[PDB]
Ligand binder design. Structure first.
Ligand SMILES: Nc1ccn([C@@H]2O[C@H](CO)[C@@H](O)[C@H]2O)c(=O)n1
Ligand SMILES: Nc1ccn([C@@H]2O[C@H](CO)[C@@H](O)[C@H]2O)c(=O)n1
Ligand SMILES: Nc1ccn([C@@H]2O[C@H](CO)[C@@H](O)[C@H]2O)c(=O)n1
Ligand SMILES: Nc1ccn([C@@H]2O[C@H](CO)[C@@H](O)[C@H]2O)c(=O)n1
Ligand SMILES: Nc1ccn([C@@H]2O[C@H](CO)[C@@H](O)[C@H]2O)c(=O)n1
Ligand SMILES: Nc1ccn([C@@H]2O[C@H](CO)[C@@H](O)[C@H]2O)c(=O)n1
Ligand SMILES: Nc1ccnc(=O)[nH]1
Ligand SMILES: [Cl-]
Ligand SMILES: [Cl-]
Ligand SMILES: [Cl-]
Ligand SMILES: [Cl-]
Ligand SMILES: [Cl-]
Ligand SMILES: [Cl-]
Ligand SMILES: [K+]
Ligand SMILES: [K+]
Ligand SMILES: [K+]
Lengths: 251, 252, 251, 251, 252, 252
């Protein structure tokens, strides 16, 4: 039995029950090399898959691509192969002025501005992380020296209009999303990203443990397009954090 | 200065309290207050009975909510007008998972919004989640008490009967939306039903207020055994001792 | 057989098939004493229950608490015990300038700004009273000398944002409710309250007869304070009216 | 000076402020001839318009066509010319077993299974008649010796799937409507027709007085397609009732 | 042998027709039929006037719909019961784009579902799109008549007044949903407003029936000019010539 | 001047292209580019591999989208910022009708919006429709290739598993919304499932961009036979030859 998109078998995972799921296929090897005995397993489409060992236990690293749809495939196929815990690491845009580029955010719940979450549970259901994963992520983030924020994340199926960006081809935002960034800001929402609503709803409704930690690459109080110089330092810290969160989950 | 419209108390009456314990039943208010020091009756109007007491030397409010989001939302608003910023809900609940037993404790990590009042604060997409510090304090208090504690999702309904898929009713029928719903929530891992957490959590999380919910299981919708009087009595007492210890953990 | 919340049995109601349902537990005795042989039955939570006799027929008086959820419990449990007709008497805020403090309103339909109504019928279903109850309420209100208005009531799950109040802790109102008071005013809606949508929808979809009559205790458009003798008279007049409406319903 | 669709002027109405609005253009002359001085005014599309006199006062009779969209045009354009009261007469299918062919139904509220109502008020708003019109309709129906039922009407934008008819080209009903007739029956809904939700919602939200009376031409616990034998007698009774209800509304 | 309840015709009355032309106005039925051979009146009941005619030897129905999806849905259903499988809608419309002139033709490639009856056939997610062969035939016929033809999205409303964002009305009010809507559709590239296409196209695309819509522009909501009476007369005549030639292409 | 944030290309890199071919799989980009003249690798970042090539003398972009509306929406936006106005989507699909075989081609005439990202461009009422010229070009290219071609409605899902009503999954459960949904779409005449067309078509139709979708059938949900490797290889090669010939037809 080889899963349809990831191109791996259960035997390939050497008993892993925890996965680290970054978005970018290029981040997969980078995470895996922070652990022991990393091995490349497969690459198909946006899905690059490695295994490694953390404190003697097998751990998967698998990219998701951007968005809930491609995420949902990776999570499902990994769960078919025995993975039960999913630690998302990603980048994010802050919508509160006091959050700085380089800070870390651990999501306590997501605003479901996606479609895939609805393929698992009706809108009433909360897009919430597993409490142990969130706790582990907070501790790992703090222990790294990062400034960490816990709170609500707005999770959008688009980068552009659903995050109320106006520097676009049309410069238009549909009625639903006009004024939405200020509305979420006033409601205390910390940040925008694109996968947590799907991930957290899928997992919380399916017997899987999940959480999301993200490095802040932009503050929307300043600009819409992230600076490229900020990215590499923020990403290095984020992946150290998520591996330490994985360590806490396995202990 | 001003007296809020429903609760019948002033800011001065609260003696600087910034934390409230909010049970549903007005008769539980005095019982909670008497677990603390120097309890003082402030007011009773409608479903709202209000006491103050001292916990490690700090004033705490105890205020009942009544049943349901609407009455809850009034109490939370009016307490926040008077300086309360942290709200600890303690209440009874029905478990829907076979592994959860009468007498266990549940700390809600998020609520299924089967209510209306939450939508008066945030659109449905918004998560009905607790403040992380409150949830952490509640888990710690509940576990330290020696209880069996479950962290997870709660289904929060505007009705006791059809929205909890009860059929033992005058009409014996449930609107389409709720037919099969208990099994759906069970399959999704939802732990329990109650009637205030969706409103409370959504209101607070979208309004700069810290909230959480801990609940004592008084029925399991899947078990035929009837719980004995002693176990229910004990569960009620343990729930309020836990929420007072969670309040202690929140005080700064 | 004792119902779960109200703490009464069918025998306790002495054959009553009609209930008067105010919101405030303290008003229950005040209504019951306008009838013969009032007797306290139970008080639990927001539910205070009396029985009395009207023209020789037993009648229940039972408070509901604030909001549809607590109302829905009381109506269900009374219906399990044989009650088939429910007369609601309450306070309200008028939103039309021609309606004065002191006037009565008989609801002909409610705007469903609640949640519990949806636990009985989908939103398309009309929150309307039983025609005989509304007719009896109108006649009783007119016979008391009050100016009475028949019309639509906006029935909200909140006192604050859902009634478009801004003098609150946050001072915000969610998008759905911004501009809503003016919208209802322009649509001819008379007043706000917090239980009629649940009550009327529940009863109209469950074979129970229900209606609502309410005393105007504020006008959201008028500046002045009403004097005490008027407020006191309005409360007394409201409960005199509901009892006379009950008399009309019983033969 | 003529309205866009109806082809009539204010002068043509000769002071009428009340309209009788049947669906079928052929019922217009029949209604007008129950009154004094009937005069043909115009016929365009589904809109046939007459005037007549009732107790010395002008009344307009104007067909609507089938459905909310065509109804909404007629109501609007008549209101532009000074009409304020709208009496709907139509045919209907009963869904309760006890409601027989030839009975009359006066709608106390409509299930909004239409689209046009939403162009006047959001779904929460009740599709409710004016209380004076409903009272006049009940009185006219009862005084005529008819068997009369007061209650909720399911008002559908289709004759076929939205009324859960299966004897159709596809034999399919979309998920929303599968099982819907039994749900309405269990909820105590009396009947199906196609215009009341739009009419009542439009009028109740726009300062216009409206009500709906209908003659039962089929009982849906029996069959789907009305028998032709009984149509003429039921329609004659219905229009006699609606004209009397208009008499009761004249000031 | 049955006579359909509203249209008052039998299958035999249609002489084997599998295509219908469906204008809105009963008075246009005879006008369309007389562009074909051997037109014969079949029935008139309510808004439904029904003729039969022959086009290149093949029977065709012409049946009015009335205004709106509800009455349209009845005519389509009852014709389909009698063997009709292809439905060509010809109607009037209001353009909302400045580059579309009074007298141009529009062939709808999809409709904005601002109706209710479409929902009685398919949930809102389903696209209100024409059959591709019908749309192709309509485009070709329109071009061959010398008209300027636009292919694009049509906003299909259950009202003439608020749902087309008209304020020159008895109340002068437009419900929140429709406030600003005309500009929103304009900015989204929508060409025009009418009142039947959403129902027609959704019903047919979800029921195994082929449908399309072609319209002549009788007003432009952005232009202050008032068109000639001769231009309007010519537009009506051209629209029905076009729909008959589109039918010919479908029957070839 | 600017380099777009996700795609990592500039306007100058596109050498004047106003048309893009947008497959799903980054690995298909080079294969499509090599069917044209002078293919040039431009960038690869995340799921976005970008090439340029020349078709009859004109520059054409080829850019992968990844799986799903969200990643598609980014590519489309960023290409539009760089001057692209016409988007030709080629992808794989699962047929749900028995008459549609593996190796056949589908050209979508409208999409069932079972996605979220479409709603970020237009409300649900708006049709997820292709540009008529692109759909016409795709039908012609597909038919001219000798393939069997189906025009019709496509169900476009944000999931591969529950939203396509697959039960052989980790949980084996499908949420209520999607229980029975494949049969409902089948009965409504829907041809196929994929995961990007609703977003793409809605975004473009509401933004002044021309788009269409063509897909090769790689599986039929109603067939038990597994297609052989040669048939799948032929299908993938035919799909990309077809999309390139469709692009040729669109060039002006
Ligand atoms: N301002 C930002 C910054 C980052 N992200 C996240 O990173 C990817 C899109 O750039 C997506 O994976 C998304 O989660 C975002 O959405 N918004
Ligand atoms: N099975 C159960 C058990 C408890 N509750 C809680 O108790 C009150 C209503 O009885 C409400 O406060 C509600 O939260 C419930 O709803 N359902
Ligand atoms: N302006 C007003 C006036 C009165 N009410 C009624 O009083 C209770 C809340 O105060 C509720 O029970 C409600 O019936 C209200 O909601 N709004
Ligand atoms: N079973 C029935 C009977 C009657 N009607 C009403 O009559 C017309 C449709 O035949 C429509 O005008 C509609 O109001 C209906 O909808 N359903
Ligand atoms: N601006 C316009 C122009 C025309 N239409 C068409 O007009 C009929 C009702 O007037 C309807 O049948 C509709 O097709 C419209 O709705 N809006
Ligand atoms: N049965 C099928 C076949 C194909 N697809 C398409 O292939 C990619 C994911 O497999 C996605 O691009 C999707 O469009 C699908 O979703 N379902
Ligand atoms: N660029 C913008 C256009 C419209 N609204 C905005 O807030 N910004
Ligand atoms: Cl309690
Ligand atoms: Cl139990
Ligand atoms: Cl009261
Ligand atoms: Cl026409
Ligand atoms: Cl014009
Ligand atoms: Cl591909
Ligand atoms: K992706
Ligand atoms: K209450
Ligand atoms: K009509």
């Amino acid at each position: 039995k080889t899963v349809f998109h990831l191109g791996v078998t259960e035997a390939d995972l050497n008993g892993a029950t925890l996965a680290i799921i970054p978005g970018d296929p290029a981040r997969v090897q980078k995470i895996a090399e922070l652990m022991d005995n990393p091995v490349f397993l497969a690459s198909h489409r946006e899905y690059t898959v490695y295994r490694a060992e953390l404190d003697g236990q097998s751990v998967v690293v698998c990219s998701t691509g951007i968005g809930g749809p491609s995420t949902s495939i990776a999570v499902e196929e990994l769960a078919q192969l025995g993975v039960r815990t999913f630690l998302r690491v990603g980048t994010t845009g802050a919508i509160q002025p006091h959050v700085n580029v380089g800070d870390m955010i651990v999501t306590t719940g997501s605003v479901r501005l996606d479609g895939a979450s609805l393929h698992f549970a009706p809108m009433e259901f909360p897009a919430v992380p597993d409490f142990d994963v969130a706790t582990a992520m907070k501790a790992a983030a703090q222990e790294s020296g990062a400034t960490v924020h816990m709170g609500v994340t707005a999770s959008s199926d688009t980068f552009y209009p659903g995050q109320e960006r106006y520097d676009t081809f049309t410069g238009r935002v549909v009625r639903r999303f006009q004024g939405s960034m200020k509305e979420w800001q006033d409601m205390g929402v910390l940040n925008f990203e694109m996968e947590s609503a799907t991930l957290l709803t899928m997992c919380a409704s399916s017997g899987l443990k999940a959480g999301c930690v993200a490095g802040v690459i932009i503050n929307r109080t300043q600009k819409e397009i992230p600076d490229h110089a900020t990215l590499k330092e923020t990403e290095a810290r984020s992946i150290k954090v998520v591996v330490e969160a994985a360590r806490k989950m396995l202990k």
